[PDB]
Subunit: 246 residues, 4 copies
């Protein structure tokens, strides 16, 4: 039957979760985190609005190749860190591993910059996203992850309903970032729980997959929905489900 269309996307879910664990391991090799305080999520969001405010003021100060530059900087660094925990844990601190990541990251970013085959893009998106998922997963525990997840899920539902209101009223009464970004979102808990086949939060993984099933059903009808809340709600569901076992 109809498999391939728009179903490699949850495949990217399972994947990013996976790659986030397999990256959980090599990642403690360089410190990271940041304390399982619940103020930690707030630090997150403060710095996130900061990050966005920054990205936007780059754009409005763009930037003929300079935008493409700055984001190249950010890239090459981030890839250097991926391959960093990867190789530099694997082959260890050796000269070989360090060249391995340097050359590794130069290679990759230069590829993605040179017009790939752009299903490639789905993969590097998977890599990176898993990366981020796993670090903020190693930064602190569920209880905060839970607060953050409920938090963002309600923000999404709020703004979605809001612009929707702007749509109904307007009569008479590149997106990939937000994508893989909110793909990471509820899998920070799939990591920060295993970081707390595997754990009982295989349940969180599948509960999250079901959250996506729900979403991808709601949206594939005319007039869309929130987005996060089915995902965070569902991942929190499947996870707190992974609690009856242990």
């Amino acid at each position: 039957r109809d498999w391939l269309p728009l179903l490699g996307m949850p495949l990217m879910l399972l994947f990013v979760q996976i790659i986030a664990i397999v990256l959980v391991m090599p990642m403690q090799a360089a410190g990271l985190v940041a304390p399982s305080s619940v103020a930690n999520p707030l630090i997150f969001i403060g710095m996130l609005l900061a990050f966005t405010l920054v990205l936007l003021v780059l754009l409005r100060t763009g930037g003929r190749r300079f935008i493409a530059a700055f984001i190249g900087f950010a890239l090459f660094m981030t890839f250097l860190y991926i391959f960093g925990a990867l190789s530099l844990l694997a082959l260890g601190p050796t000269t070989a591993a360090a060249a391995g990541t340097l050359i590794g990251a130069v290679a990759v970013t230069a590829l993605l910059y040179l017009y790939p085959e752009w299903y490639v893009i789905d993969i590097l998106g998977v890599l990176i996203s898993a990366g981020v998922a796993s670090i903020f997963g190693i930064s602190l525990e569920p209880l905060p992850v839970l607060v953050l997840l409920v938090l963002l899920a309600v923000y999404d539902a709020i703004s979605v309903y809001r612009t929707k209101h702007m749509i109904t009223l307007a009569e008479g009464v590149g997106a990939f970032v937000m994508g893989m970004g909110d793909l990471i979102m509820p899998s920070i808990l799939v990591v920060s729980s295993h970081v707390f086949l595997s754990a009982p939060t295989l349940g969180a993984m599948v509960g999250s997959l079901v959250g996506l099933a729900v979403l991808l059903y709601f949206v594939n009808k005319g007039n869309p929905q929130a987005g996060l809340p089915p995902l965070n709600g569902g991942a929190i569901l499947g996870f707190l489900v992974g609690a009856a076992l242990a």
Copy 2:
């Protein structure tokens, strides 16, 4: 005379003053304030100037929702500290207390964003406004509040007169910020006094009621007036009278 129209505003005056005294109470529970020096107003002038400068560059980074984002943030934090101290007085440091604040705050801001009954707003404004009123009122003593108040009174009469003259000459010779904001102002002295039935600065409360009496009379006639000076001039009046008594 006439009641409910534009007398719910002084309703909001006595209110926010009241709520600001009742908030005098729980607030020392997390410290706050701030030194009874008069050097506070000019640094204050500094920091409000910074804050407005900030709010504005937020706007210029709009930001279809990023505006609403950052300001929603600032708002919700402030609500969480409201319900926070609320909790740390009632149940005190308990886990339950902190959650009480979460749910409280979520309730409040998520409500306020989802288009309520918007007599709600005058109220939420009363809440927040009472928040700031009560803090800076708990922040240090009368005399500084007094000077700061004279200072601001002169800035308003200045700018208002400035632009008014600018209208008469030009022939040939969102507002709730400044609003509930100016509703807050003379309640700090009402607070910073009970902080210094209650204080003899119940008189400042009634004096504030006389300031609004004057303002809401004159402004309610064609061709407006200064604004602040009737309010602070009058509240400081009633206050220093309530100093002349006891």
Copy 3:
């Protein structure tokens, strides 16, 4: 003959200098300065680029009254320090002195802002300008001042010449800030020499007045010249003239 018109500039020269010495006095009551280092002039120029970049990004982030607001702050600070040293020297350490200053500065700025008679302006300009003049005069010694004056006389002469050429080429081959400001300029050497009727660098004052004799001679003619260099040149002249006595 024609004396009084457009000869008030050297008059305010003599004036701003005089008031600058009378202001040399009260100022140590609150410190200021900043070591006679030859690196300090650059601290100055950097921080002026700071002040201007600030001033410009304020303007283009303007600013309904917010411009007039912010410059109201900066102004009022400056006035409170003027009357601060004035009174706190005059009335001495007393509380009374401090009030002398608030009452003073509020009075003054409220005035200048409420459409005075704006011959006021030349005087407040004399005050303020003299103030800044003496503060930085108290910041460090001659030798650095000498170099600094040469430098600014050159920025003036270069940019003047540059845009002049841009005028000869362009055919076929608020100013009050730079005013009272560059009026302050050559009098910082008249102060920091008074620290190295009175001193023998009265000569720098009249010699500088003669630099202006040159200047105000040229201005009233078609096709200008530099500006600073006749003044700083003339003041350094009068100063190294004032070297033979002491």
Copy 4:
């Protein structure tokens, strides 16, 4: 015959390299560097991206002369450091030397600002370029220079190819900065080798002349090329041969 045209560029290569070396010797006299670590390139890249971001936020904040200002700043400081170290070696810290630098730098930037003869500019450009060349060159050793240079050549090739494609697709399918800057590029490695007639990495210099040979050939044919890669590739070539030598 065709001498002076587009063959003065390799002469300026040899020159900037030479002046970078003859200045290499005296330069360790005030510290410099920044540890032959490879984290140096990545932080660096950060700092150039930052510096440009800053320079730009100047530019759109022009600033009729404020632009010209800040860049005048950078200029005269840097010339004062050139003639600065120049003097602090010879007569040493004495007044004669430091005055020599000031006056020197005065001469130079004041000249270079007043519309020169602009073969002058190739010369002062050679000066400055040799300066920066020798500093980051004395800043630490090769292997980092190796990594950094590989990085820069690849980014250059990336953006050139990118916008080239961007040119072929739009059918139907002030410049001296990047100049003397990447003229410096392969001469830091020519320097970080004397900091490591002369060395056997005199070869890197002719390898660089071969890189420029290649480049001034390709580009001087209709439809240009990358730029860095011939230069860095070739200088690294001649250099690594001078490693096979010893």
